[PDB]
Design a protein around this ligand. Structure first.
Ligand SMILES: [Cu+2]
Ligand SMILES: [Cu+2]
Lengths: 121, 120
């Protein structure tokens, strides 16, 4: 539904803000809960409808490409103004009612396919 | 993840960014889906651990105090940088892992008690 389980991780309410007018980039957001006793990392994102996905997981330096670190028994927020995944080069114009299929790749927990909900206004 | 149904509305993953202590104000966020054919509005928020809550529901002017309008068959995101609820005058330091109990007040659908997760 709006939450996806992989290993002892939970990806909750994945969503993205659609490209603004004249822009071709989108931003992907989610809440990732690590309910396990070992750390993990979001290391890659695969998406067919965009050219590529770049993880910006260091909130203190968002210009840098960096994985999202997922300490044990902690949750991490990807949200506007903080850590997020940049979705570059949309193949088509995004409409809200559409969802966006993505694959999140975690170093330890492996891959999980999600359907991200779209914010366009 | 916490999800709440009231009428044809769904409130998903309510959360807040804890006060940048020493400051005593927090910001409340949520995803609100109106899956019905009638409009509603988020008009008030009640929270016992804060002095008051002020809704800034107009994305075009975030300074304005205004309800969150919830048109039919649409969803609204309250998120950092956009529409949100300001939680003013924390009475005490928040305990992060426990969440924050709040009451959302909708014009038509009425009240809903939620447990908001805390981003620290
Ligand atoms: Cu969460
Ligand atoms: Cu939602």
């Amino acid at each position: 539904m709006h939450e996806y389980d992989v290993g002892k991780l939970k990806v909750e309410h994945p969503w993205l803000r659609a490209p603004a007018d004249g822009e071709k980039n989108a931003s992907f957001y989610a809440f990732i809960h690590n309910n396990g006793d070992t750390p993990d990392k979001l290391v890659a994102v695969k998406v067919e409808k965009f050219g590529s996905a770049v993880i910006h997981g260091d909130a203190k330096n968002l210009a840098l490409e960096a994985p999202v670190l997922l300490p044990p028994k902690q949750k991490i927020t990807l949200a506007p103004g903080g850590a997020y995944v940049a979705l570059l080069d949309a193949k088509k114009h995004l409409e809200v009612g559409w969802g966006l299929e993505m694959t999140l790749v975690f170093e330890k927990a492996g891959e999980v396919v999600i359907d991200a909900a779209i914010d366009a206004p």
